[PDB]
């Protein structure tokens, strides 16, 4: 500290007195993130784990809003054969809130999963399920042989093959009108060049892997300027006390020490402010208790020493800090032999103005030599 005092005054010699060199502060340990129990989960499991599945031509549409897209539990399960995402990474959308989400479920053949693509053209894409060029969602499919098959086969599925014109993107229409070719019109009968739009669709246990039925659920996420209704799973870290650490309480960032408090908040109140409109009390989102927010150390470093003549040792005074927190106030990085002696060890005295290191407390009273504060003075005499 003598060298620091010398070079703060731009002189190799110093006089008797106290000089302020620098300041100290306490680093946050890692971080703090807190959140309540849970927000309401989206009914994605109901669509995925559904006993009955609608046909591809009559795919059911469900509105998903006012919940959380907790798809991370199933993403890592790897229980779905296809999890391809178009226009966005599967994990990137997790940390984002989407205003409108829709769920579409249908059962198609294994080889027909490729037809569910943005802008895809085919007998199924252009007649049963059409996807627009703007497809921000992902296509999810998995095997359904254990549920959509039985002895003797199944014949409860239907699909559309013939229509007057190509289906518009995300357009569904059901009608019993028989498609009639322009060259050979039928005028309302089942004659030549006239086939019913609906045809029998079924599966049997003897079908191959590409012919087995597959349960396909289409989840799409898009953004609106309206307040968001769907978001991603929230993460919550452990809560620590009596330690200076960064905190993030429901988006409120800050640095300080979170300790227990005796003040009681109102049932609806969340934050707390003082006369100087600074946050100093934030409730725990998990459980109902109030934690105060306090600064870690602040303060400054002051060096107390006599003149360079007839004396060489120095004493260091830290302002507005407790003697227990001194070793972690900007340390563990300096040159050890001549800095740990002035930071820890003996000759530790706690004063009103702060913690004093390197000076031995004496019960005797003498005339003031070096001003410190609260009637405490330091002298080089024995």
């Amino acid at each position, epitope marked *: 500290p003598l060298s620091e005092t010398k070079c703060t005054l731009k002189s190799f010699t110093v006089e008797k007195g106290i000089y302020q060199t620098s300041n100290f502060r306490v680093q946050p340990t890692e971080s703090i993130v807190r959140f309540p129990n849970i927000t309401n989960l989206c009914p994605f499991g109901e669509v995925f784990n559904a006993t009955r599945f609608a046909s591809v031509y009559a795919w059911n549409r469900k509105r998903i809003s006012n919940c959380v897209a907790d798809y991370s539990v199933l993403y890592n399960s790897a229980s779905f054969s296809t999890f391809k995402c178009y226009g966005v990474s599967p994990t990137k959308l997790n940390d984002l809130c989407f205003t409108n989400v829709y769920a579409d479920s249908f059962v198609i053949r294994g080889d027909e999963v490729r037809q569910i693509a943005p802008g895809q053209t085919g007998k199924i894409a252009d007649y049963n399920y059409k996807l*627009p060029d703007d497809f921000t969602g992902c296509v999810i499919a998995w095997n359904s042989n254990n549920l959509d098959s039985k002895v003797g086969g199944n014949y409860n599925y239907l699909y559309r093959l013939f229509r007057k014109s190509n289906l518009k993107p995300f357009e569904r229409d059901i009608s019993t009108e028989i498609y009639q070719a322009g060259s050979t019109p039928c005028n309302g009968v089942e004659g030549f060049n006239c086939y019913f739009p609906l045809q029998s669709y079924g599966f049997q246990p003897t079908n191959g892997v590409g012919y087995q039925p597959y349960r396909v659920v289409v989840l799409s996420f898009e953004l*609106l300027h309206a307040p968001a209704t769907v978001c991603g799973p929230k993460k919550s870290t452990n809560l620590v006390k009596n330690k200076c650490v960064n905190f993030n309480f429901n988006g409120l960032t800050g640095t300080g020490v979170l300790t227990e408090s005796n003040k009681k908040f109102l049932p609806f109140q969340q934050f707390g402010r003082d006369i100087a409109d600074t946050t100093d009390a934030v409730r725990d989102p998990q459980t109902l208790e109030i934690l105060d927010i306090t600064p870690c150390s602040f303060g400054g470093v002051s060096v107390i020493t006599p003149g360079t003549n007839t004396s060489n040792q120095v004493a260091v005074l830290y302002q507005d800090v407790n003697c227990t927190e001194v070793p972690v106030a900007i340390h563990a990085d300096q040159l050890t032999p001549t800095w740990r002696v002035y930071s820890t060890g003996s000759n530790v005295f706690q004063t009103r103005a702060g913690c004093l290191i390197g000076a031995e407390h004496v019960n005797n009273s003498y005339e003031c030599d070096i001003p410190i504060g609260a009637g405490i003075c330091a002298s080089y005499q024995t």
Partner: nanobody, 121 residues
Framework: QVQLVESGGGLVQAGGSLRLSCAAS????????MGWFRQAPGKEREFVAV????????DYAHSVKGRFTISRDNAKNTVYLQMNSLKPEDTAVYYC??????????????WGQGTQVTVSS
């Protein structure tokens, strides 16, 4: 009423690059996303690209994925759309459209006048 003003465009050859700018004026405080549309002579309009308010979450059409680039300047209320690896099939009149991304169809509350872009072989 939101007003859209377009600028840029022109004639470009195969493998060239082009830039498009669409500006929004009026009650733009409730506007977050703007998209571009194309239609060929005798063909319906189709989605091209879109940029979010924060600059992320952009989605491109399958035929144009990995080739286009879009950027939004909130300070100037103008969105710059960059074209790379252009192909003669990209010859159409480009329309910038202000709307909200909705599942099923990108609804547009107001459509801009637009400008033409020609790509030769």
């Amino acid at each position: 009423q939101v007003q859209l003003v377009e600028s840029g465009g022109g004639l470009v050859q195969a493998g060239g690059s082009l830039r498009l700018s669409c500006a929004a004026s009026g009650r733009t405080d409730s506007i977050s996303d703007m998209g571009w549309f194309r239609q060929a002579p005798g063909k319906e309009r189709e989605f091209v690209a879109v940029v979010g308010w924060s600059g992320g979450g952009t989605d491109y059409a399958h035929s144009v994925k990995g080739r286009f680039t879009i950027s939004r300047d909130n300070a100037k209320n103008t969105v710059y759309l960059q074209m790379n690896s252009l192909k003669p099939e990209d010859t159409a009149v480009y329309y910038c459209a202000v709307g909200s991304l909705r599942v099923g169809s990108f609804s547009v509350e107001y459509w801009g006048q637009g400008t033409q872009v020609t790509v030769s072989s």
